[PDB]
C-alpha cells in the first residue's frame, strides 16, 4: 500500500481543491480543506471548515446545480455539476464539484469528498458556442 | 485535523481517479491508484502500479501533452494538459491530467499526486467550436 501520513501530505499539496465533509441530516459539514481549496475561495481554513460550504453560493442560491448535488447525495451516487461561487472579495467564479459519497461501515454515519476547479474558462467558451450555434 | 486513515479511505472511494507517483531520474513510477482509476483505465491495480503509466499512451506517443508535463515537472510547477489514451480493451479516451509536484523534505526524493478525468465529451464540443469558427 501507502502510508497513509504521505498520501495525507500529497492531498495537501495537490493544486486541485480537495475537501471532505461529514453529513448532518439535510446539511454537510466540512471536516478537511486543502491550501489549494483555501486559494479558489479565498477565506481561510479557520474561516471554512467546520460548516456547509453552501456559504460560496450567498444571495445567488437560485441554482440549479444545488439540487442536482442534493439528489444526488440523498441517492448514494456521485455528482459534477458546476455552481457559481464567490470569493472573500466578492470574486466570481464557476466552481466543478465532483462530490463523491462515503459510507463508513463502522461509523455508520456519511462522509462526502469534492475535488474542484476553477472552470470558469470553460464556460464563457462554450456560451460562445451557444451563441454561434 | 482529520484521521489520515479517514482521508485514505475516502481518496480510495473518490469517483475521480487520484493516483501519487515517485521519480525515479526521468521515470515517474507509480505507488498509488484507486479504484477510480482502474475503471478508467480497464487495467487492474496490480497491473498498473509500480511502473510509469506513460503505458497508457501506447503507440500514440507523439503527443505534445508529454512534452508539457515533462517541462512542468522538471520545473517543479504543477500541469494539467489533455491526452490520448488507450484501455486495456484499446478504447481510446481523451484523459485530462492534473499533475502537483510534491517535495518530501524528510525523504529528500519527489512524489507526484495525479488527479485524471475523461473529458472526451469537452474535447469534442471545443472540435464542434473550432470548425464553426
Ligand atoms: C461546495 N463543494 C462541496 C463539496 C462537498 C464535499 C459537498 C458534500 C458539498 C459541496 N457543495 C454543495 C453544498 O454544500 C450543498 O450540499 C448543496 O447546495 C446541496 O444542499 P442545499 O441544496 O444547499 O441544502 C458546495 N457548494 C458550493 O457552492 N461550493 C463548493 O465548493
Ligand atoms: C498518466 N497520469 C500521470 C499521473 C502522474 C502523477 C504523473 C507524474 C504522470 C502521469 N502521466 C504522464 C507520464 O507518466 C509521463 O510522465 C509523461 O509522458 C512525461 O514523461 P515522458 O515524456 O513520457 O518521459 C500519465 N500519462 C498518461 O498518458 N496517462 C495518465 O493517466
Not at 66 to 90: F, T
Amino acid at each position: 500500500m501507502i502510508n497513509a501520513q504521505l498520501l495525507q501530505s500529497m492531498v495537501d499539496a495537490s493544486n486541485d481543491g480537495i475537501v471532505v465533509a461529514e453529513k448532518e441530516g439535510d446539511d454537510t459539514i466540512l471536516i478537511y480543506v486543502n491550501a489549494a481549496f483555501e486559494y479558489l475561495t479565498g477565506y481561510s481554513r479557520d474561516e471554512i471548515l467546520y460548516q456547509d460550504c453552501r456559504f460560496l453560493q450567498g444571495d445567488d442560491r437560485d441554482q440549479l446545480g444545488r439540487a442536482r448535488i442534493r439528489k444526488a447525495m440523498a441517492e448514494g451516487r456521485p455528482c459534477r455539476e458546476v455552481l457559481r461561487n464567490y470569493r472573500k472579495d466578492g470574486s466570481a467564479f464557476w466552481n466543478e464539484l465532483s462530490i463523491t459519497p462515503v459510507k463508513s461501515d463502522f461509523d455508520q454515519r456519511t462522509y462526502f469528498i469534492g475535488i474542484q476547479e476553477d472552470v470558469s474558462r470553460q464556460v464563457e467558451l462554450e456560451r460562445e458556442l451557444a451563441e454561434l450555434r
